Amino acid sequence: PSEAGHRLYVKGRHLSYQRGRRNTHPKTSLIKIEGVDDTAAANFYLGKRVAYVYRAQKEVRGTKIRVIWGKITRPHGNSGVVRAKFTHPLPARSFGASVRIMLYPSS
Amino acid sequence: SHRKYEAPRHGSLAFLPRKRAARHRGRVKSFPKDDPKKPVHLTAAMGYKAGMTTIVRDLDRPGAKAHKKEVVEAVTIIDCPPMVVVGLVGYIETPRGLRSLTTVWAEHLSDEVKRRFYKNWYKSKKKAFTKYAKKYAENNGASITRELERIKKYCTVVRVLAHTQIRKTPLKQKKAHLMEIQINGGSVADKVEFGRSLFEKPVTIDTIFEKDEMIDVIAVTKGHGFVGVTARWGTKKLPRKTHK
Amino acid sequence: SSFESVVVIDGKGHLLGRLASIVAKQLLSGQKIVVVRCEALNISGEFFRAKLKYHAYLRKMTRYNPTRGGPFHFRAPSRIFYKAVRGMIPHKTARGAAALERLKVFEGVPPPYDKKKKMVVPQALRVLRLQPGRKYCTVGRLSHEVGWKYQDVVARLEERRKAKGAAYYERKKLAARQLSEAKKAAAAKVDPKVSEALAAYGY
Amino acid sequence: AEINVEATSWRRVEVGRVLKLENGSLAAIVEIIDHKRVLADGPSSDPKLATPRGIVPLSRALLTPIVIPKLPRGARTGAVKKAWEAYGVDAKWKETNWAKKQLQQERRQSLTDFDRFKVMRLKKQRRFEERKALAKIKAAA
Amino acid sequence: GRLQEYQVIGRHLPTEANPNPALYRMRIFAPNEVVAKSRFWYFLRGLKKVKKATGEIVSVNVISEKHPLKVKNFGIWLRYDSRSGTHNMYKEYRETSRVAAVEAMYADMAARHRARFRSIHILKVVELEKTEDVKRPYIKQLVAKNLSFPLPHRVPKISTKKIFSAKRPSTFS
Amino acid sequence: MRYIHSEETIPVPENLKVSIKSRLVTVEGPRGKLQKDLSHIAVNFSVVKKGVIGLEIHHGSRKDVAALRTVRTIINNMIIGVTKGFKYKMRYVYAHFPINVNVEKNAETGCYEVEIRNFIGEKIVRKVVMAPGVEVEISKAQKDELILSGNSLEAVSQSAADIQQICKVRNKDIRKFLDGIYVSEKGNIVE
RNA sequence: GCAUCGGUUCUGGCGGGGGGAUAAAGGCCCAGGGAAUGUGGCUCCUCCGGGAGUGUUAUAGCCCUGGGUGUAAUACCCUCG
RNA sequence: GCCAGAACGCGACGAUACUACCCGCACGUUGUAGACGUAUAAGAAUAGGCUCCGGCCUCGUAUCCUAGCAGGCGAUUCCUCCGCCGGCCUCGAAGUGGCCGUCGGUAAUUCGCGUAUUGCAAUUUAGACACGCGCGGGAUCAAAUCCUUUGCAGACGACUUAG
């Protein structure tokens, strides 16, 4: 009975920071969106929020799972990459990790 | 500036690592190429070196200066008591080389071989192949007769494990030596059945080799402790009035 | 653009450099790649020029000790392809080392990876990139002559695999025949209005 | 002297062919400017198939199996339109395999969220009948 | 660049010994009506003793093609500079507008002779009136009776971001 | 400058058959079968009339159009070869030392092998192995004549060249020492 | 976290106005003149696809000059929301 | 052919006491370059192919699966689909799949009860790999080093041997 799934977000990957050729700026990060190619499509997800969830070792308040919150700001390039700002810069070891992208602030 | 007078090189770089051998028994690294139209036969043996002596014979070499006259040549004597087959192994081909996948030993083993799998044989319990023997006389060797079919089906070369009878020599050692010998038979079915027949029965060297034919010899040379450059490579000595 | 668990690339018919570049981006992104049949890659140009380029490679070696530090010249087609990929990754860092651990390369089709779906990268296919009239070669032939030993073993192993994959094809054809014929007989039995409803929605 | 040759056969670029552009538009060739570019026009009543007059690069067209018979080269929009209606190009292209497949494409994209639910349930009902039939033939073998 | 044909009208400043000077007209291909005037002065300084500081500009207009949907053959007479001298040239083109011919000629010269835009003079452009006065063979082939030709081995177009196709493409489109 | 259409034709006599598939030509007549693989050339084959073969190239360059006439004569040679065969003749030339030849047919390998002895009074014995399908003979109409014959012109000519190239003089004047086996006339078997 | 604002800024869509040969072209109509990569007819060779010659709209059409409904539409530049 | 053998490359085999080994679940410290439908097996040509031979068809924008307190309790109604076990065949490139049987679950159609209060959002703590622990069942009762000795070996270690 009801063997279907439960997903209400779009999955993305954390590629890199924003950088020149020899300098990096950990303030903003770049994320790869599932299914968008042109920059016209990427216009949909401006303003939405994104979450990065990971496991820890100790437990603080009935949980061993932490979260960092951010939002999408503007498009990037011609291929659909977008920029994002989080309340804390991402840990710089999560290059290639997966993040969740909600749909909260809608239409 | 260039070297004034030229000269060849001292020593050879082909035999480059001049270190003590890793193992005391010689290592056959390649067997003769297989030919599937001959009859089954072994391709190696092993013995002990006794000494040297001198002979005299008459030469048959048309066109030489010593044709049909008496010459004096040196020879060496190797002492070769018979060997005893113990088992056989089968190898298959892989994109990374050859590899073995099965072994099948004989029912009864000798104290000579069993002494090889131990370093302190005196204060031991000598339980080498005790439980393996129970494979025999259990469901009529079912487990034994399945491995042999596997070699018949998958394998492409077969080798025989053999050991010497060191008790028949004047040596003080009692630990036998064990090695492998490849069969160049004619078909995988033939060369596994022939191997089975020779289990726990001696084979003499006159069935292996034959007179006036050419062979190869593998061994480990004599030892010298730790020598200087003049003797190791063979370079000229410096003048008598050299300091330091 | 999608994120699969593991993707299997069939190497036959691709260009060496034009495939390593695509693949080297995926590894750093976070994907997992498995390259199969590297014996059958391609290189643009003519075969003799590939020889000369490789001979000039074989001449580089540390002078004072050829057993340390010197460029070690691997001879197998997978290792040739692997060298190309390692050129395009900062392999001297932990990030680059981690990326390389997400790659596997083989000759032929090993047991775990046959009976799988093999993808194709159309931005590197020879029949789509090169111009008709020019010449090309094959890494398999190149590697055999610089001293690779296992050409015939892999040749006959592949022959066995493709022989097994013929009875399998007949089962697929039989299965398809039954599904198609069942549809023709079952569509008319009981389907008053569902058919037109689906046809209007586009199915 | 029997000869059996099994080779390929493409569709030619001539006067009378109708190209299919990317934005679902049709045009008819009137004169071949060059190897890579041609001059073409499609007059059509349907505002989806009509196209202006201009030059079109051949690297952005598809050769369809329709060809207007005996179209004089360099013709004008008026004369080409007469031949278009007399041959019935738009009517002929409607039933072509490319059209049917193209028509399905927009319908699928138009399914509303509620419609997606209904088609999913409807598919199950048809599937159930098909599953029974397959079992009967498979068991009988 | 993206060119257009201008008519430019200029004159020497009138003086007491010579009121009402003569008027000179030229046809100039240029991207905009600023370089149009500059080209006019450059070509005039080499023919008659007139500067720009001692002259004035009477008019500048745009000439548009008279039948930009008809195909026609062109012949161009030009002169250019090599690395070791000057030479004369004559080439032919087949298209629908005079402006494009100058576009095509500039690309062709820059490719085949490494002649930049700096060193080229356009003596005359004229569209070939009849068909029998075509000389070059690379266009004579393009005006044959009942022309038709297939297009073999044309790659299909695939999205530059759709990696990992699932079947072998085909070039028989 | 690329030509828009280059076309050539080939007439076929009504005594044989020809089939083309993936650039694999097969010709069969009253003397056997021959095969060739033209996968390295981009050509379009087609049937113009009931007895005419056609082959064409579109939008080819100068270096590429050159290869059409080559293909034509290759396929023509196959057609003529199957219906009329080929036949080469070779002659001996020596001043003092006579040349001796032996021709023995190999059994279980089919092909022939020649044997040249006493060349310019030489003590070595040199052996050459012909190609499959060619038949070697010693003439009976003239003296010191060899006769090579077969079905495929390429093999016949290449086999003749092997014999000619094996017999060379070294460290002498080739203007004065004119010894060797040479070719003297090329033609067909029939007519 | 949401709603209503102020400053800076990026990015989409819609309604108008002006200019040039008061765009050039283009569709329909009227008047005049030309040819060919010559339509339909006619003659000639082949039954084997078709090819060759004459000749100015017929059973297809094209080019050049002037005018009409036109203060036509649209492309380009500028501008008010 | 010949020489060395990665001291972080790999295989076959012999004997394995001490909880070191095997089987079942029972939790839960503790680990991970990073599950959330982690679903899709022909080979070959690209100036030619596939096929249920109708002759049909050639751009994964595809096919399969997809409802129910994170998915309860009963009913009408259909023999479809899924899973643990057990028995036979088969699989060696780095060994995998198939058939049969018992058992457990199961909207293709239509209904009847329960959901509230987490208060207007806050990871949907839940997947598979190893590792440490606790029980209760089976099998099993080994070696190595020091020490003495030899000299086919040796600067000392190491090595070939004997007890």
Coordinates of C-alpha atoms in Angstrom, one line a residue, chain C:
Chain C
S1 CA 21.7 16.8 -17.4
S2 CA 21.0 14.2 -14.7
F3 CA 22.7 12.6 -11.7
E4 CA 23.0 8.8 -12.0
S5 CA 24.6 6.5 -9.5
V6 CA 27.2 5.0 -11.9
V7 CA 27.4 5.4 -15.6
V8 CA 29.3 3.0 -17.9
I9 CA 30.9 4.4 -21.1
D10 CA 31.7 2.2 -24.0
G11 CA 35.0 3.2 -25.4
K12 CA 34.8 1.8 -28.9
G13 CA 34.7 4.6 -31.4
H14 CA 35.7 7.6 -29.3
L15 CA 38.6 10.1 -29.4
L16 CA 41.3 9.8 -26.7
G17 CA 41.6 13.5 -25.7
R18 CA 38.1 14.5 -26.6
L19 CA 36.8 11.8 -24.2
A20 CA 39.2 12.5 -21.3
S21 CA 38.2 16.1 -21.1
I22 CA 34.5 15.3 -20.8
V23 CA 35.2 12.6 -18.3
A24 CA 37.6 14.7 -16.2
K25 CA 34.9 17.3 -15.6
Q26 CA 32.4 14.8 -14.4
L27 CA 34.8 13.3 -11.8
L28 CA 35.5 16.7 -10.2
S29 CA 31.7 17.4 -10.2
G30 CA 31.0 14.3 -8.2
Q31 CA 29.9 11.7 -10.7
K32 CA 31.2 8.1 -11.0
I33 CA 32.6 6.9 -14.3
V34 CA 33.5 3.4 -15.6
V35 CA 35.3 3.1 -18.9
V36 CA 35.1 -0.2 -20.8
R37 CA 36.8 -1.5 -24.0
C38 CA 39.8 0.9 -23.9
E39 CA 41.5 -1.4 -26.4
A40 CA 39.4 0.1 -29.1
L41 CA 39.7 3.9 -28.7
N42 CA 40.9 6.1 -31.5
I43 CA 43.5 8.8 -32.2
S44 CA 43.4 11.3 -35.1
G45 CA 46.2 11.3 -37.6
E46 CA 48.2 8.5 -39.1
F47 CA 49.6 5.5 -37.2
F48 CA 53.3 6.2 -37.8
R49 CA 53.1 9.6 -36.2
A50 CA 51.7 8.0 -33.0
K51 CA 54.8 5.8 -32.9
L52 CA 57.1 8.7 -33.1
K53 CA 55.3 10.6 -30.4
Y54 CA 55.5 7.5 -28.1
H55 CA 59.2 6.8 -28.9
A56 CA 60.1 10.3 -27.8
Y57 CA 58.2 9.5 -24.6
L58 CA 60.2 6.3 -24.0
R59 CA 63.5 8.3 -24.1
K60 CA 62.8 10.3 -20.9
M61 CA 64.3 8.7 -17.8
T62 CA 66.1 9.8 -14.7
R63 CA 69.9 9.7 -15.3
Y64 CA 71.4 8.8 -12.0
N65 CA 68.9 6.2 -11.0
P66 CA 66.3 4.7 -13.4
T67 CA 64.3 3.0 -10.5
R68 CA 63.1 6.2 -8.8
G69 CA 61.5 9.4 -10.0
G70 CA 61.7 8.7 -13.7
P71 CA 58.7 8.7 -15.9
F72 CA 57.3 5.1 -15.8
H73 CA 56.0 4.2 -19.2
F74 CA 52.9 2.0 -18.8
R75 CA 52.0 -0.1 -21.8
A76 CA 48.4 -1.1 -21.6
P77 CA 45.5 0.7 -23.3
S78 CA 43.8 1.4 -20.0
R79 CA 47.0 3.0 -18.7
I80 CA 47.4 5.1 -21.8
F81 CA 43.9 6.5 -21.3
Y82 CA 44.5 6.8 -17.5
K83 CA 47.6 9.0 -18.2
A84 CA 45.5 11.3 -20.4
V85 CA 42.9 11.8 -17.6
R86 CA 45.5 12.3 -14.9
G87 CA 47.0 15.2 -16.9
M88 CA 43.7 17.1 -16.5
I89 CA 43.3 16.9 -12.7
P90 CA 45.3 18.5 -9.9
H91 CA 46.4 15.0 -8.8
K92 CA 48.9 16.4 -6.3
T93 CA 46.1 17.5 -3.9
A94 CA 43.6 15.7 -1.7
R95 CA 40.8 16.9 -3.8
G96 CA 42.4 15.6 -6.9
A97 CA 43.3 12.3 -5.2
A98 CA 39.7 11.8 -4.1
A99 CA 38.5 12.5 -7.7
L100 CA 40.7 9.8 -9.1
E101 CA 39.3 7.3 -6.7
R102 CA 35.9 7.6 -8.5
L103 CA 37.2 6.1 -11.8
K104 CA 37.7 2.6 -13.0
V105 CA 39.2 1.5 -16.3
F106 CA 39.5 -2.0 -17.9
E107 CA 40.3 -4.0 -21.0
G108 CA 37.4 -5.9 -22.4
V109 CA 34.2 -6.2 -20.4
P110 CA 34.8 -7.7 -17.0
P111 CA 32.2 -9.8 -15.2
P112 CA 30.6 -7.1 -13.0
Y113 CA 30.0 -4.7 -15.8
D114 CA 28.7 -6.9 -18.6
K115 CA 24.9 -7.3 -18.5
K116 CA 24.6 -3.5 -18.1
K117 CA 23.6 -0.5 -20.2
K118 CA 26.5 1.1 -21.9
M119 CA 26.2 4.9 -22.7
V120 CA 27.8 6.9 -25.5
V121 CA 29.3 10.4 -25.5
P122 CA 28.3 12.0 -28.8
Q123 CA 30.6 15.0 -28.4
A124 CA 33.6 12.7 -29.0
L125 CA 32.4 10.1 -31.5
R126 CA 34.8 9.7 -34.4
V127 CA 32.1 9.4 -37.1
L128 CA 30.7 12.8 -35.9
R129 CA 33.8 14.8 -35.3
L130 CA 36.4 14.0 -38.0
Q131 CA 36.1 14.9 -41.6
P132 CA 35.6 12.1 -44.2
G133 CA 38.9 11.5 -46.0
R134 CA 41.3 11.9 -43.1
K135 CA 43.0 9.0 -41.4
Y136 CA 43.0 7.6 -37.9
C137 CA 44.5 4.7 -35.8
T138 CA 43.7 2.6 -32.8
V139 CA 45.3 2.5 -29.4
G140 CA 45.1 -1.3 -29.4
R141 CA 47.5 -1.6 -32.3
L142 CA 49.8 1.1 -30.9
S143 CA 50.0 -0.5 -27.5
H144 CA 50.7 -4.0 -28.9
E145 CA 53.9 -2.8 -30.6
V146 CA 55.3 -0.8 -27.7
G147 CA 55.2 -4.1 -25.8
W148 CA 51.8 -5.1 -24.5
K149 CA 51.4 -8.9 -24.2
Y150 CA 47.7 -9.7 -23.8
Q151 CA 46.2 -8.9 -27.2
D152 CA 45.2 -12.4 -28.2
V153 CA 43.9 -13.3 -24.7
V154 CA 41.5 -10.4 -24.7
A155 CA 40.6 -11.0 -28.4
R156 CA 39.4 -14.5 -27.8
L157 CA 37.7 -13.7 -24.4
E158 CA 35.6 -11.0 -26.2
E159 CA 34.7 -13.6 -28.8
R160 CA 33.2 -15.9 -26.2
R161 CA 31.3 -13.0 -24.5
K162 CA 29.7 -11.9 -27.8
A163 CA 28.7 -15.6 -28.5
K164 CA 26.8 -15.8 -25.2
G165 CA 25.1 -12.5 -26.1
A166 CA 23.3 -14.1 -29.1
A167 CA 21.0 -16.5 -27.3
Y168 CA 20.1 -13.6 -25.0
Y169 CA 19.1 -11.5 -28.1
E170 CA 16.7 -14.3 -29.3
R171 CA 15.0 -14.3 -25.9
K172 CA 14.5 -10.6 -26.1
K173 CA 13.0 -10.9 -29.6
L174 CA 10.7 -13.6 -28.4
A175 CA 9.6 -11.5 -25.4
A176 CA 8.9 -8.5 -27.6
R177 CA 6.8 -10.6 -30.1
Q178 CA 4.6 -11.9 -27.3
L179 CA 4.0 -8.4 -25.8
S180 CA 3.1 -6.9 -29.2
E181 CA 0.7 -9.7 -30.1
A182 CA -1.0 -9.6 -26.7
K183 CA -1.7 -5.9 -27.1
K184 CA -3.4 -6.4 -30.4
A185 CA -5.7 -9.1 -29.0
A186 CA -6.3 -7.4 -25.6
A187 CA -7.0 -3.9 -26.9
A188 CA -10.3 -5.0 -28.4
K189 CA -11.6 -7.2 -25.6
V190 CA -12.9 -4.6 -23.1
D191 CA -11.9 -0.9 -23.6
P192 CA -15.0 1.2 -24.4
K193 CA -13.8 4.7 -23.7
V194 CA -10.4 4.5 -21.9
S195 CA -8.8 4.2 -25.4
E196 CA -10.1 7.4 -26.7
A197 CA -9.5 9.2 -23.4
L198 CA -5.8 8.2 -23.5
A199 CA -5.5 9.0 -27.2
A200 CA -6.8 12.5 -26.6
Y201 CA -4.4 13.1 -23.8
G202 CA -1.5 12.0 -26.0
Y203 CA -0.9 8.4 -25.1

